[PDB]
RNA sequence: UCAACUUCAG
């Protein structure tokens with residue numbers, strides 16, 4: 001639903017890298033090159049960003065219960 | 068490398084990222100125990116479920 | 117009949133990484149030092165959360181989980197802080213904990229990214245490794261998150277939120293000479309980065325009298341503790357565990373006498 | 374123990390209320406067992 | 422108590438034994454609104 | 466509450 005803080009396998013903080021990853025993808029970088037630029041090295045950490053599905057954006061479309 | 072002792076495991080081990088699913092069957096929903104609980108009216112035997 | 121004298125050579129030292137080599141040491145000692153890196157180095161992390169208002173899409177305990185996983189600078193005061201169990205005061209106090217506050221509302225139309233920067237600490241030494249930022253939640257307009265949190269000292273054996281390190285790379289015998297791992301086809305196997313072999317030779321010749329020594333470590337910090345001080349604190353903590361064990365052992369031996 | 378005449382039903386045994394319990398819902402209502410309804414039908418026809 | 426309206430998201434106070442209809446919108450789905458007492462969550 | 470139905474588990 002939202003990018004997890006810390007990769008499950010090792011624990012490196014991946015929560016701060018999702019917006020940068022999306023921006024680098026917008027730039028032109030391939031997924032692998034963006035992952036390298038963000039500093040993700042082990043495939044455990046690259047799985048976190050590469051496989052992430054951001055549903056929080058779809059859930060934010062619904063109006064809040066209390067405004 | 069063995070986690071407990073640090074020695075290399077002699078047989079090299081197949082590791083990779085595989086997709087796993089968490090099925091709805093969980094132990095907390097299944098654990099049950101009975102000891103002189105409620106009893107049916109007709110049979111006067113322990114209840115079901 | 118006595119302990120060997122180990123030697124350390126630090127190859128790389130960066131704000132995020134320490135690559136070092138320990139020579140003339142046992143495999144058990146080396147592995148347990150790595151194990152203490154992972155699980156027995158004290159750190160500061162959020163362990164008490166009280167959410168006054170959470171209208172975000174994520175439920176309260178989801179927010180609490182994410183807050184706990186956020187790293188917090190624990191370089192100096194983690195040694196000064198006491199465990200909550202040790203502290204005499206009831207619940208939590210400045211000596212046993214650090215207080216954080218979050219008061220974010222998305223008044224604007226554009227989505228508000230609540231980050232670790234929005235967490236405000238009562239003591240300046242502990243900050244959420246902000247000096248991007250870890251994203252706690254995204255808030256739509258009209259959605260508000262308010263909470264108070266308390267961060268306590270602890271180590272990774274309790275919970276992975278207290279792990280000071282990301283990945284501890286531990287390698288010994290880079291070229292297989294003790295045959296601790298027996299390759300079915302040695303040539304297919306990639307050379308290690310620490311390997312000194314020529315490209316033609318897949319494995320070093322079997323050393324019958326050899327013993328695992330010259331262990332190579334790469335310790336990556338999570339940012340809470342400096343990677344150097346992770347290793348130093350681990351060595352000191354293992355020594356303290358051994359000394360406590362010796363004290364209790366001496367007491368029980370005296371009792372038996 | 375068994376005479377052939379006794380096989381023909383001249384007296385119908387009505388089982389005790391233990392055999393045919395009254396199913397109570399919320400105290401608002403008391404459903405009756407299938408046996409109670411069938412016995413009610415038998416009593417009605419017998420009275421007729 | 423005070424019930425937040427399902428549609429117009431305006432808090433309305435409805436007494437007991439009173440029909441559940443928000444004033445000014447008429448929606449018939451209300452929500453109880455979060456409790457004042459606070460619950461401690463271990464971040465674990 | 467009880468009967469019925471369906472869906473699952475091994």
Ligand SMILES: CO[C@@H]1[C@H](O)[C@H](n2cnc3c(=O)nc(N)[nH]c32)O[C@H]1COP(=O)(O)OP(=O)(O)OP(=O)(O)O
Pocket residue numbers: 475
């Ligand atoms: C091995 O035999 C068992 C038992 O006989 C018992 N059992 C299961 N279903 C039934 C049933 O409907 N009726 C009756 N009476 N017994 C039943 O289950 C059988 C196997 O079934 P399976 O073949 O699916 O076992 P996997 O080979 O599939 O095991 P995986 O790798 O998933 O763990």
Ligand SMILES: [Zn+2]
Pocket residue numbers: 007008009010011012042043044045046
């Ligand atoms: Zn990882």
Ligand SMILES: [Zn+2]
Pocket residue numbers: 203204205206207208209210211212213
């Ligand atoms: Zn205290």
Ligand SMILES: [Zn+2]
Pocket residue numbers: 426427428429430431443444445446447448
């Ligand atoms: Zn309304």
